[PDB]
Amino acid sequence: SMQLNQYTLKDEIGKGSYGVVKLAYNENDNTYYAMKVLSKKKLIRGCIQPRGPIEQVYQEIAILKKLDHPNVVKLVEVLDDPNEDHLYMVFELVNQGPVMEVPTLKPLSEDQARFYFQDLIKGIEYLHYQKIIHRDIKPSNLLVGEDGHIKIADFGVSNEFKGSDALLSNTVGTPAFMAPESLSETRKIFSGKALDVWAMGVTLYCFVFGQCPFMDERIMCLHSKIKSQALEFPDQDIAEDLKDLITRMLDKNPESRIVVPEIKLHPWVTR
Numbered sequence: 001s002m003q004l005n006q007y008t009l010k011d012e013i014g015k016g017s018y019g020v021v022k023l024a025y026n027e028n029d030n031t032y033y034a035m036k037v038l039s040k041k042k043l044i045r046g047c048i049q050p051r052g053p054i055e056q057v058y059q060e061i062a063i064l065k066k067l068d069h070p071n072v073v074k075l076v077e078v079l080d081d082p083n084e085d086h087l088y089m090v091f092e093l094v095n096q097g098p099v100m101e102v103p104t105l106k107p108l109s110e111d112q113a114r115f116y117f118q119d120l121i122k123g124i125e126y127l128h129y130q131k132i133i134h135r136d137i138k139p140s141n142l143l144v145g146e147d148g149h150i151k152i153a154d155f156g157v158s159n160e161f162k163g164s165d166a167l168l169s170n171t172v173g174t175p176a177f178m179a180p181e182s183l184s185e186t187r188k189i190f191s192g193k194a195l196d197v198w199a200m201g202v203t204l205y206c207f208v209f210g211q212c213p214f215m216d217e218r219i220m221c222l223h224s225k226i227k228s229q230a231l232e233f234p235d236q237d238i239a240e241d242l243k244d245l246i247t248r249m250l251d252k253n254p255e256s257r258i259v260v261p262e263i264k265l266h267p268w269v270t271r
C-alpha cells in the first residue's frame, strides 16, 4: 500500500485514459473510498474544438459538487496541489462495482432489469432537474451499492445548462449509446435530455439481452447502423410491454422519442 494524506491506497479498481482508480482507506473515519488518480501531464498527452483536458476535468468536478442523490455517485474530496502532477478525486465507495460489462453471456432477468431501470429513472430525473445532461449512460457506468441499488457514475462528458434543455453540438459519449441526431456529418444542434433517454433505452436493451441493439467493431459502421437500421429484437423472449418501452426510447426522431415523465408512467415500469 501507500499513504496519501489520511488515506491508505490499496488495490487498483479501475483504469482508463483518465488514469487509475484506487481503493482508499481513510484512517481518520475507518471507511473505504474510491480514489481516482489523474496525471496532468498525461491528460495534456459535431467535431467542435472542446476546452482543454485538465479544464474538462474541472468541469466534471464542478458538476459532481452539485449532486446529492441516492442514485448518483458522491464526490467527497479533491486534492490538487498546484506544484504536483497528480489530481485526486475521492468518491464514496460503491461496494459492488459496475452492474455489468457488455457484452456478456449473463444478461439480467426482466425483474432485476426493472429494479435497476427504476433506479436509473430516478437518477436521470434528478440529473435533469439539476440541469445536467449525463451523455454517457451505459451499464458499466451504473454502480451497485451495498443497498443493492444503482448509482450513476462518470460525469466526464456531462453538460450543465440553463433553461429548459441543453443546446448541444459536440459528438461525445460511448459510440454504441449515442443517439442518431448526434451523429450527422452535417454540423447541427440537438437537445440534451433526449440523448440521455436514447442511452437509457440502449442500456435497458443491454440489461435484458447482454448485447447492444446496434453493434459493430467498426465505429463508422456502428454510427451508420444507429442512424439507418431498424431496431430488432432477438428471438431469445421478453414481454411485449418491455419491447414497447424500449422501442419508444429508441425512436430515431428525438421530437417523438418518449420523455422521462412518460417513462415513469409506462406499464412495464409501474408493474
Ligand SMILES: CC[C@@H]1C(=O)N(C)c2cnc(Nc3ccc(C(=O)NC4CCN(C)CC4)cc3OC)nc2N1C1CCCC1
Residues within 6 Å of the ligand: 012, 013, 014, 015, 021, 034, 035, 036, 073, 074, 091, 092, 093, 094, 095, 096, 097, 098, 143, 153, 154
Ligand atoms: C471512482 C470512479 C467511479 C465512481 O464514480 N465511484 C463513486 C466508484 C465507487 N466505487 C467503485 N467501486 C468499485 C469499482 C470496481 C471494482 C472492481 O472490482 N474492479 C475490478 C478490479 C480488477 N480489474 C482487472 C477489473 C476491475 C470494485 C469496486 O469497489 C469495491 N467504483 C467507482 N468508480 C469506478 C467504477 C469502475 C472503476 C471505478
